[PDB]
Amino acid sequence: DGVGNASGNWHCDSTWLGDRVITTSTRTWALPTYNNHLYKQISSASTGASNDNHYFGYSTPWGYFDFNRFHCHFSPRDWQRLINNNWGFRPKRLNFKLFNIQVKEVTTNDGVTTIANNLTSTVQVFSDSEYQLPYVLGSAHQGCLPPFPADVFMIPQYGYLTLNNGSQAVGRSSFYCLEYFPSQMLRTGNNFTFSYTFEEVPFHSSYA
Amino acid sequence: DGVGNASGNWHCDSTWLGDRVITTSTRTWALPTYNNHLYKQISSASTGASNDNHYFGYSTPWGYFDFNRFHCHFSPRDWQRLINNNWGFRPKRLNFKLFNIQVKEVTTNDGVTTIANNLTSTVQVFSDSEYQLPYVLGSAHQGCLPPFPADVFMIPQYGYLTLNNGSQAVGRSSFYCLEYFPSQMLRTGNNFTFSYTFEEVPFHSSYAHSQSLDRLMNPLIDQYLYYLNRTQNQSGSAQNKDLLFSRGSPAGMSVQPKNWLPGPCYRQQRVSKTKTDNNNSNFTWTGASKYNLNGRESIINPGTAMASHKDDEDKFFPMSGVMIFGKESAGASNTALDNVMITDEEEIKATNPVATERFGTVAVNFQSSSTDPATGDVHAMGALPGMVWQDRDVYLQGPIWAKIPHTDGHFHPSPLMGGFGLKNPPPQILIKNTPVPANPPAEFSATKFASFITQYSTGQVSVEIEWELQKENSKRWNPEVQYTSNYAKSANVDFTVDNNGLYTEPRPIGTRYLTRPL
Amino acid sequence: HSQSLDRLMNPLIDQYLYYLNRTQNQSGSAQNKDLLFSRGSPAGMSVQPKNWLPGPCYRQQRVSKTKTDNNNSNFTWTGASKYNLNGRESIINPGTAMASHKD
Amino acid sequence: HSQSLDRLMNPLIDQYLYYLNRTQNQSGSAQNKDLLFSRGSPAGMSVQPKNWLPGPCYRQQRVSKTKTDNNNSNFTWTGASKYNLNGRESIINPGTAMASHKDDEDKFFPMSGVMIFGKESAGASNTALDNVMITDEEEIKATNPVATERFGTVAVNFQSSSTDPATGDVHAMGALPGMVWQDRDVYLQGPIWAKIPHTDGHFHPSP
Amino acid sequence: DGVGNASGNWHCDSTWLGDRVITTSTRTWALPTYNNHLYKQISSASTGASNDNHYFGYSTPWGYFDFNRFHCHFSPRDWQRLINNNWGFRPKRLNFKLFNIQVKEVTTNDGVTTIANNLTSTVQVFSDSEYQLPYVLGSAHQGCLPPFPADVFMIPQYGYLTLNNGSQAVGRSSFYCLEYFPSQMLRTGNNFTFSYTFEEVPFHSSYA
């Protein structure tokens, strides 16, 4: 509980139990300000695209965490110790944690830009556990956790697409204001945790 | 519990209890950012080295704490109060603590670089208590705690070596990411503590022997065992070959039947401390005792614990058979003799051979009426049964422990630098600054980060080892040899600071001062 | 082992122990015999003070698997390492556990 | 021991391990260098793969009990195995527990490798052979080397198409792993115990 | 318990009880950095002195508190109310306290030297209650508490003398590293207190 007190430790171990493996993975992140806090609507009119590449959507000032690659959780050794003596695997439950938050204010003055430290600024975090936003994950995008644990990554920008009569909207094109979701404002001494349990999915056939 | 609250006190006392001494030692440390947070791989390709000096490894952004010298825990007074009235010592348990952490961010602006104070930045500390990283400690490196408690030191950089086909890797060369270890992120109000218990190691022999190994007999009484004395008569008429046996022998002690043997040997070379009493060559690689491991050579250095020189022949030292420490104003390459501290290892002359001379001679052939009996010269000698020795002396400057390598076999696991061989040594405590990046751009880019905030941390660190003493039980009459300071009109007191605050150690202090019979 | 015995050091940090480096000066005027000690040595690892020793030895003889890279003799009894027990000999075979060949 | 150390095998059954047998063909046409391996070997027991080693060694010198079968010298200090402790020498005497002599070669004793007791009417200096009792230590010949002869030979150099394979002669041998031995025999006249010296290290503390 | 919380009050009263007087006295102090953190050894070689004024010693980066003058505890009125109607006095017990610690970092830049405030820097304080350092007090030196309570004083530098064969040391000249004493590192929210009881000393004859 900050200021001079850390709100979480670096857990990045991987305990192989008997008929299960628990993989933990901590990363350092960085989140800029996107769109200068605006809900800019994006489309394909300004681009001059083909008929196939037209889109209509909305870009948000919100970031999103994605850990949807296998090297975000498995080292190359733990992958080898997985693929070579197992006929299958599936995830049972995850456990997310967001901690040691540092909000930094930057101020430009003749290219001698100093970075100071806002102790009172907050960060809004919510997990959409009711699946009522467009699920942009599961689309093989960049901006995951890095493969190597000693890398600092940059959080992507959340932006969704909806229905499009070409490069124009249809009356059923949805619009989502994400400040109409209950967030958790996290000042520098606070942390975000939630837990998730995967439903019954079949084992991946890790065999020929 | 910070910010405005200290998370530990300065403990640097040394309580001498009855059959034990507890030494505490706090130091102020400083930790930079190494490799700019990168895992740079290091090898010998860019260096242009010889075949012997090739390596392949990995340097890390992690630091490590090392307190593997005896002056990190003992003052010169507590060392004197240890070596002079104890026949042994060994460590029982240590107790590590890391406290009062201050992470400072530095910012350059036209050489008017200001240092500010990150209250929210963290520091990752873990102790590898399962010994699954390469144990770079136990290698006599710099960057320990300083000898003098009022010095601020800089934490070294952790970097390991692995298998190398020359300057290239082999498929079995391991790679260790140290962020794949559970750390403890320490913001400025937090502290790191752990405790360690040493396993059963034998006491260090902090004594000399008061009696030689070849002089363990009664000088007044002869024996019942005989030896062959003459193979030729003194009748002087001719070659009168006759086997003459003799009861033996108070008047000749070199020819009595003995019962034990002096220790192993591996000869070094005479280097006198007078330059004129040396061969005009170099002679420090071509004529040095060296071992061959995977086609490349390495000087033994020091090797087998042996006596440095013969009696009243104090000027010769074995070429690589002694620990050589350094005084200040010594360079890192080709320093003069006046800047080093060459240790002598002549208190173990009673059991151990001279390092610079053979362990005796053996027979070569079969003597007959024609073939005169030729002998050879044993230079290296392994372990025979019935063989006793003493290990290498520890010093106030020198190392405390080392890790016994995890091998299927090992003979007498005492390190050749002296100290305590430990299968499970004190674990490596590794520490780094958490990377706090600078401003990311407005749009997304997955080429991760080259722009960090240039920062460093400082703090205090206190190590507390408890040592089990072994009291003398001596029934010696006359006074024994002590470590005294020369009471004379001196310009500078030994083991104190100078006119401008440089702490110097004028000579190496061993621990073999008391005596006991063999 | 993932690590050699003569390579158990930190390749980044030097030591506090010194070794004799030169027994002759580089002044090149004459036979300038002088004992030059050196702090040692991240850049030379063969000359650092070590702490352990490699195991025992009892040498065998080079037999290549290519017949042309061998001596034209036999050489399998006359030039083999053997022990003498009660006046009669016997090849060690295998003997001391040692590496078969160099890198 | 009722069985030698180099004879611990089944004399009826061969092995699955092979050894290099010939480095040259019997075709006799030329220098036909060829590596011939052979399954081995009930008919040759000196070349089988063994599993242990005979004990340590430190050679003594042949002194026969017949005066004529000796060198005409003295030869009892100049040609004796001795150790060097603090610049001064001392004969080992007896030293490493080793066999006194080879089979059916009972007249040679090692110069200082045997316990030599005394009968009565023996003097204290330069007594004759008829007044002493030289012990024999040949019952440990099964595990221990002969005191008066090498513990085998080792290689010296690298054999090639030019350098013929030279061997050396091991005279003193320390402790290798995989090495067994028997200690020196006790006698009715000889000592019972001794004190192990109070040292930091000592190898196999038998006197 | 700091930062924004004072760790002691200003007590400077003087209660005259019946057969005793309790004098309290608070002062503001200032402690520089001496010797640039070094144990500089001092002697009389560089001075060029007489035989009588030779010395050999050691100066330390440590300060010391001294309150060994009578006006550090008595006002001129309380002294008059002591000397005029008492045939004697002696001290029974003292009670020391060190509080409201402020560590200030100064930074020079073209003579526009700013003084900032280290919230995390510590101050090491110990009382040598076993008398195993050279007792430089009881020598009538400067650097006590000031007589007047509204003065800020500067803590002296600790430095001792030992045995001297002229301007050189003798083998029995002691050397004392003061970081070989258990200190109490005091960050800005911490305080130092200890208590002392005087042994039986005779009353001072405050009479003619």
Numbering used by the authors:
A (entry chain A), E (entry chain A): 219 to 426
B (entry chain A): 219 to 736
C (entry chain A): 427 to 529
D (entry chain A): 427 to 633
Task: Give the exact sentences the study uses for this entry.
Adeno-associated viruses (AAVs) belong to the Dependoparvovirus genus within the Parvoviridae family. Because of the broad differences in their tissue tropism and transduction efficiency and the absence of pathology, AAVs are the promising vehicles for therapeutic gene delivery. Adeno-associated virus receptor (AAVR), which is a glycosylated protein containing five polycystic kidney disease (PKD) repeat domains in its extracellular portion, was recently identified as a key proteinaceous receptor for multiple AAV serotypes to employ the post-attachment events of viral entry. To dissect the divergent rules of engagements between multiple AAV serotypes with AAVR, we select two AAV serotypes, AAV1 and AAV5, and solve the atomic structures of their complexes with AAVR by cryo-EM.
